Each structure stands twice: as structure tokens, then as C-alpha cells.
Design a protein around this nucleic acid. Structure first.
Lengths: 251, 61, 49, 164, 54
RNA sequence: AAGCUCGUAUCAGUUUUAUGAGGUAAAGCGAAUGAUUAGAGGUUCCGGGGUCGAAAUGACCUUGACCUAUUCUCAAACUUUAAAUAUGUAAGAAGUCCUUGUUACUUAAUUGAACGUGGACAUUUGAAUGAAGAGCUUUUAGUGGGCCAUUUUUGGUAAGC
RNA sequence: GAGAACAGAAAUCUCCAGUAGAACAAAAGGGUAAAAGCCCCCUUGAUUUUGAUUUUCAGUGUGAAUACAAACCAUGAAAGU
RNA sequence: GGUUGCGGCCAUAUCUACCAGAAAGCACCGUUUCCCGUCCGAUCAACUGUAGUUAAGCUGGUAAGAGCCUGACCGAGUAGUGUAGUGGGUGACCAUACGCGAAACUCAGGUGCUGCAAUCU
């Protein structure tokens, strides 16, 4: 590329160059002297991140957070990325942010933020919406993108939508691998076989889990490992240094 | 479509004027809180024991 | 310059006023320079005026 | 960092619209097992008897192990010999075959004879970094394939020499 | 045809005065949802300063 | 002109401080763009058009559809940077702070918003200088062919243009 | 720019580079890159009531426009528009 | 101190080239019954964190690199300009008095800073 080319063009924003944030969508959400709250739900590999985030020109403020790795405290230890654990996390923030406001006074209202995930019906994103709306937040929505919505008619199946909450599409799929082709069933679900959790009891585990979330949402932190300063020492072992000019002049 | 500094800077000068009248009320002393333009500067003894002044001799051309 | 000659009360020709020297008033003399003659007066002239 | 085939693209370019466009569309359907997609023309040249947006030609893309059968059966028509160049700087190759009955078919006097273009694209694993939507990135030079790396790979399996 | 000569010297005979910025500016043009509330807000606080503090 | 309500009112063809806005002079062209004068041949790479035609395998024409492989030079309708002079706003009593009243708007929330009660802040009360008073209203005359000069300029070779 | 039967100066397909050199009904100048371009999906807000404001201006008209209020709606999971 | 989520200011953060990254975290990767979307489970959807990986991604370090940004008794008080005279010159234009004051260039130095929540030898 020529010299005058790189002198000319301006870069995008750093949070735009790195592909994380869509600045067309953010301007609608933030600009709505009252702090304006927003439900940010992100789905990576092996994790669920659900945060209620306000807005400030300093840059942001987080009111509450629920993570997937806190679910083993509540009794869900397997399959953390699926639809049903996403519903349980949506229940989880709703009890959590409400207790610190003491409402558990019209409703408390939050706006859903997706990110970049494409809106398809039956997505795992809106299970976090359904959990917060059942939990007690005013999250405005319509019954389009829930699973069990027919494209033909303007109707919903509450029986199928109850099923996906309690691990229906998982535990039915355990039944098709149990009778057929164990070699597939031995590879997947291996945490279920070691803990000896059969398929029908999986619906019993999620049902006790929502009773566990409404019991104690007070979020004890993980204790920690060694310290900050012990953790700061080992991280300095890998990180290099800058070079001075006199070291670079003779080079 | 914009926002303007000078008034918000004017507000900070009112805040500083609030403190100066509070201190002078405690210990009796004049406030002298008005601003002043630049004054003609004072006398000063200047001795150049470091550096003897040099001629310029406007030759150049 | 004509507004500045009124603000220093120099209405008619051969009229004179004392002016306190600040940074603010020095620029007022800087505009009306082709019309005024000024200097620093001693104790003798102020007593005689 | 192995050297898997991403996809196999099967193309046929026909000058006219009509039966000959629709007959060859059935050929690529029964061969690839997939319903093909058609492409319309961008503009009019009039040396070719075309107009804008006429659905001039068909193509179809195959991925996975089913594409490797179509390549291995197709390249035997070329008798395990490519020509010398045939390779991009990026790393990919294609070869065009006449007489689709060479890979055998019922004769089809209604359908007839067509010449299929083939093209192969090559990539290493880790190519989702470009094609994904969130946190898009570019593949580095050490992982970009080469024209060289296609020569080493294709000489090894399918037992061919390149040529010249 | 057109010239702007002597046009500055005419306007600076009576000077250029300001529109003198009254107390209590007129609420015509202010948002009507605010005007409808602010009608009732002054009504209660005139009643509350009548009976309570007297 | 007749005056009217008051009598230091807060204003000013001005500066200063604190911030805004601008894109001409100069700089820039080995930081993009950028003309101009003249044009040599390309019969389904066009057809913009003209007359014709009992048709369309249809003729006759013109600007040409196309610059096909050319160079160097700039600008009022080119730009990264950007003076001077002119220009907007602020320099407080209708203001600042403390305490808590009103509402049918706004907030998850008497939280905000807007307007206030009560209390505190005094002549250096918030730059300089000036003020033959400041503020306001009625009503009506004449005029609505202008020319000259310095400087910045457009058209015209150049004009008491 | 590099590759593919016929296939070439220009058909379709493929990949890398690509700050807009393209397109946005039309003059010219502004504006625009997960859009204001391009391709699809659903639609009628190109609706009702009449006030306020900006431009030319005597701060009259006319045309054009901007920000709300009261109604009913369209789209979207949603904020919004 | 290292990563992750959401950001503010938007190149000191870009671009090109090589080189390193214990830990945890992100990522690549595994599969196709259900929801869904295609010509194509590649993007998108679901399922599993189980079979495998730091080769990339990203993070960091380097390059008498390109670029960018701060500094300059650098250019230069030069160019330009406000005001003044019965100043000069046939003119073109130039001196002087009171003022304001550039730019490219040159050289020196720099190569992201940081807010909230959480997790880590």
C-alpha cells in the first residue's frame, strides 16, 4: 500500500475495529437525568454472561451479574450452554437485582440487549428473556421468537415451551441415543453417565433448581486463589519489557 | 447541537469566591475578591556577574 | 477611534485627562495613537494644572 | 494444521436460456444430490446473444466427504494429470472436463452433452476466523496456504504429478 | 441599483438595543405536557401557603 | 412635536480576561483531484438522432458510438495546515449555598424537574472606562433620480467606462 | 491481481488485496460502509385535530422545512423509528 | 499483574514484517434428534465441553520501516496584514513609525490511556 494511502484514511472505533459492538444499535439503547438500564446477555463457549448495565460518559456501570459457573452452587452441574440453563440464568438475575432494590413501586423495567446474535425463532438468547420476565422484571417482549411458535398460525404451544424449560429437547435426545447407537451415547453425555443421571430425572433437577434460585440469590463470591499480589507475581514471569534507546542504538 | 464552556467556567469562579468570603469572615481580613487587569511591573535590581553584556553591531550586509 | 475618544472624555481639541495605566487602558491608547500625544507627567505639571 | 478441502464448486456456463439451461440444471442435481442454484447476467454484451438478468448459467457447491468422491471420479477423466499452472497464488485449483458421459450416465437423448467446469478451494482448519460475524479477523501469513503447499499436497495423494 | 452606503449610519442613530429579558418568560412555545403539569403545580402551592403558613 | 411612569436606572459604534465559530491572504504540489489548444484511423465493441419505406435480411445519413499504447504545464467553480481585520457569548441580587413544601408530568423509588416558603450571604456584590438622566408610547412632515476619494475587487485592451 | 471446457478486449465461478476511486430517479455541492448503497420480509404515518417555530421578511402572504401535543395504526423480540 | 463482559476518548490505538505467550479465560475444533436457515450444518441454528489443539485468532515484544501525535532562542519575527504621513518612485511597487503574527519544512522525543463488574499461580 502506498505512503499517501495510509496517511489519508481514518480508522474506525477501537470497539468497532475489533468486531464486538454495533454502534448503530447502541445509540438507540443508551440515549433513552434518569439512568437507563439494559440487560446484556452474551453467549460464548461454555459460559453464560447476563449483566444489567446502565450508562455514563465515564463509560458504564454494572448493577448485577449472573454467570454460568455459579450454577453448580444451585445444583446444575452439566450442560451449561443449553437452552434451559439460559432460562435458569434469566431467572437468576431477576431475583438478584430485585433483592438489592428490595422489591421482592410499579414494576422494575429492563431493556434487552442482544449483541450481534441473529434473531431466529427458538434461539437460546430469548430463554434469558423468558427467565427475566417470569422472575419479576418488566422486560417487554412478544411471543414471536419463543420456541413453539408456528409460522403458519398466530399461536403458541405452552406445552412445548414448558418442555424446553425443563430440559425437554435434551432428555428426549438421551432417549434416542440410549436405544440406538450407544457408541454415540458413550461419547457424549459422559458426565451424565458418571454421575448416573437418567433422562427422566433431568426434568426433576431443573424443577428443584428454580426453587433453589428463588431461595438464596445473594451471590456469595468465590473465595479466591492466593491473592492479587501472588497472582501479580506469576503474571510478570511471562510478560516482557520495553527496550531503551541506548540498548537499541548499539544494536 | 453544542455545549459551551465559558458559563461553566464562570460557575467555578463563583465557587472560589464563596470560600474566600468564608475565610475572611473567620479571621478578619479584606477579601479583595474583584479581578484586576495586568499592572505595570515593579522595580528590580539586576546584576549580571554571570554574563557580561555583549555588543550586537548591526552589520549584517 | 471616535468612540474611544469619547470614553476618555476627550471631547474637543486641546483637552486633557489623566489615565490610569493598566493592560486594559493601554490598548485604548493604542487605537487612538494618531490623534493624541501623551507622556508621563511629573509632580510639577500636575500641581500647575 | 492439515490441508482439508473446503468445498467443491461445480459450474456450467450456457449461452442461452431455455431447455438447455433447465436440462443441464437436472444434470448437476442428480450428480451432486443437491438442487442447484442459478445465476443471472449482470449486463448485455450482444456478442453472446444475452441480455441483463436472464439466468444465463447454473452452478452447485458440494462440501464434505461427498465432494471427495466427485473430485476423485472427475479427475480420472483427466487421467491423473493436471497442467502446469492451474494453481492460484492463494492455493486453489480447477479443471474443466468435456463430455459428462465420461464419468458415465444413461445416455439421455433428451438431455444430451454438456461440459462441466470444476473448481476446488483449499484451506486449513481455523478458517472460521474470517467467515464468522462477531470478532472477524484475518488469517496470518504462516497459516495462509501457498501456491507451494498445493503442489506438495496434490503430488502426494491421488498419486499425480503436476506437469511440465 | 443597490448599495448599502449610509445604511449603517442610519441604524446607529437610535442605537441597537436589547429585547430587555423580562422575569417570568412566556410559556407559549414551551412543551404542552410540561405546561399542563405546571398549571396544577402552582395551584397547590398557593393553597398550601394560604392555610398552613399564615 | 406633544408628552407620560420614574429618577441610578443598567445600558455602550470601545478595550481586557475566559471560551466559541470562519476557511480568504500566505504556505502546500516528489499530501488526492486538475483543465486547456489541436486529433490520425477503429461498418453488428451503438443507434443519440434525419428522411424514407404495404416492412425489416433496412436502405440512406450524421454527432459519432470507442481514445484504443502518448507526454508536460495549473486554477475564481483543487486541498492537509492556516494569520491579520471584522464577529457570537459570558464577567452575578432575577445570583450562590443550606433546610424541606407543591404536582394530575417524570422515576423501580418523593428520585428528578419546575416553582416556592423559612435561614444564611452586604458594599471591592464579583474586569477596565464612560454615562448633558434611563425607560416607554402616540402621531405626523419631507425623502425613496445621489455623486467623489483612499483601500479590497468583478466586466472591459484601456476609459472623466 | 491470480486460477477455471468451448471462453477471447467483456458471460459464469473462485480467492486475496480493496476508505469508497461505486451506487443513492435528476443539476451542482454537501452526506453515507455490520449504511442512507445492494438483495429479501411485512406494510400504508403519502392518515385525523388544529396551534408553535425557522427561511425569503415589513419579521404580512405563499411555497418548503424543523421540534412537540392529542388520537388511531405500521414495523421490530426490543430500544426506537 | 494476565485474560473475559460492557464501554469512554477514537491511529500514541493504524499498517507491514518476523518472534514469543506457564496459568485461568477466549478461540479453533466434535456432532445433526429437536428449534431453525441454506444450492451447501461453511456463515446461521441447536447439542456436547465429551474426542483433540496453541497452527492461527487475540495478547505482547522487536524493525536506523511507512504513518500518526505531542515539542522547539527550527523555519522566522520571515511571509502576510490593521492603522499613519504634503514619505520615496514616471510608473511597477518599495522603505519607515505604532501593532498583530503564520505555514510546509528541519530537528528532538513518543507508539494507547483508562471506567465498572467478575475470574485467575
Amino acid at each position: 500500500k502506498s505512503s499517501a494511502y495510509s496517511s489519508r484514511f481514518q480508522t474506525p472505533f477501537r470497539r468497532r475495529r475489533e468486531g464486538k459492538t454495533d454502534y448503530y444499535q447502541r445509540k438507540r439503547l443508551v440515549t433513552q437525568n434518569t439512568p437507563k438500564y439494559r440487560l446484556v446477555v452474551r453467549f460464548t463457549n461454555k459460559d453464560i454472561i447476563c449483566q444489567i448495565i446502565s450508562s455514563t460518559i465515564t463509560g458504564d456501570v454494572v448493577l448485577a451479574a449472573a454467570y454460568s459457573h455459579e450454577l453448580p452452587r444451585y445444583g446444575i452441574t452439566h450442560g451449561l450452554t443449553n437452552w434451559a440453563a439460559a432460562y435458569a440464568t434469566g431467572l437468576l438475575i431477576a431475583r438478584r437485582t430485585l433483592q438489592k432494590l428490595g422489591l421482592d413501586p410499579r414494576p422494575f423495567k429492563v431493556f434487552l440487549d442482544i449483541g450481534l446474535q441473529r434473531t431466529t425463532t427458538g434461539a437460546r438468547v430469548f430463554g434469558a428473556l423468558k427467565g427475566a420476565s417470569d422472575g419479576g422484571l418488566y422486560v417487554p417482549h412478544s411471543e414471536n421468537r419463543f420456541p413453539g411458535w408456528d409460522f403458519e398460525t398466530e399461536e403458541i404451544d405452552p406445552e412445548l415451551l414448558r418442555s424446553y424449560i425443563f430440559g425437554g429437547h435434551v432428555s428426549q435426545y438421551m432417549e434416542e441415543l440410549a436405544d440406538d447407537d450407544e457408541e454415540r451415547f458413550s461419547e457424549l453425555f459422559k458426565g451424565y453417565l458418571a454421575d448416573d443421571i437418567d433422562a427422566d430425572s433431568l426434568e426433576d433437577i431443573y424443577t428443584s433448581a428454580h426453587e433453589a434460585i428463588r431461595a438464596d440469590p445473594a451471590f456469595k463470591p468465590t473465595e479466591k486463589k492466593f491473592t492479587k499480589e501472588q497472582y501479580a507475581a506469576e503474571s510478570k514471569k511471562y510478560r516482557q519489557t520495553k527496550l531503551s534507546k541506548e540498548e537499541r542504538a548499539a544494536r | 447541537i453544542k455545549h459551551s464552556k465559558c458559563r461553566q467556567e464562570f460557575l467555578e469562579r463563583v465557587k472560589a469566591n464563596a470560600a474566600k468570603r468564608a475565610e475572611a469572615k473567620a479571621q478578619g481580613v479584606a477579601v479583595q475578591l474583584k479581578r484586576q487587569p495586568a499592572q505595570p511591573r515593579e522595580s528590580r535590581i539586576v546584576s549580571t556577574e554571570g554574563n557580561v553584556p555583549q555588543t550586537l553591531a548591526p552589520v549584517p550586509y | 477611534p471616535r468612540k474611544v475618544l469619547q470614553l476618555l472624555r476627550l471631547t474637543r481639541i486641546n483637552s486633557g485627562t489623566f489615565v490610569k495605566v493598566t493592560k486594559a487602558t493601554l490598548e485604548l491608547l493604542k487605537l487612538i495613537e494618531p490623534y493624541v500625544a501623551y507622556g508621563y507627567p511629573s509632580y510639577s505639571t500636575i500641581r500647575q494644572l | 494444521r492439515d490441508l482439508k478441502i473446503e468445498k467443491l464448486v461445480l459450474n456450467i456456463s450456457v449461452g442461452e436460456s431455455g431447455d438447455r439451461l433447465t436440462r443441464a440444471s437436472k444434470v448437476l442435481e442428480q450428480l451432486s444430490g443437491q438442487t442447484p442454484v442459478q445465476s443471472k447476467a449482470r449486463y448485455t454484451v450482444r456478442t453472446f446473444g444475452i441480455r441483463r438478468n436472464e439466468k444465463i448459467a447454473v452452478h452447485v457447491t458440494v462440501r464434505g466427504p461427498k465432494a471427495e468422491e466427485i473430485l476423485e471420479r472427475g479427475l480420472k477423466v483427466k487421467e491423473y494429470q493436471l497442467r502446469d499452472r492451474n494453481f492460484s497464488a492463494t492455493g486453489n485449483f480447477g479443471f474443466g472436463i468435456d463430455e459428462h458421459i465420461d464419468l458415465g450416465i444413461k445416455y439421455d437423448p433428451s438431455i444430451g452433452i454438456f461440459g462441466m467446469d470444476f473448481y476446488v478451494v483449499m484451506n486449513r482448519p481455523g478458517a472460521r476466523v474470517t467467515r464468522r460475524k462477531r470478532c472477524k479477523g484475518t488469517v496470518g501469513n504462516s497459516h495462509k496456504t501457498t501456491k507451494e503447499d498445493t503442489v506438495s499436497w496434490f503430488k502426494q495423494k491421488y498419486d499425480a504429478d503436476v506437469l511440465d | 441599483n443597490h448599495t448599502a452606503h449610509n445604511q449603517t449610519r442610519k441604524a446607529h442613530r437610535n442605537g441597537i438595543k436589547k429585547p430587555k429579558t423580562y422575569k417570568y418568560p412566556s410559556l407559549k412555545g414551551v412543551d404542552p405536557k410540561f405546561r399542563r403539569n405546571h398549571k396544577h403545580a402552582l395551584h397547590g402551592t398557593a393553597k398550601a401557603l394560604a392555610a398552613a403558613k399564615k
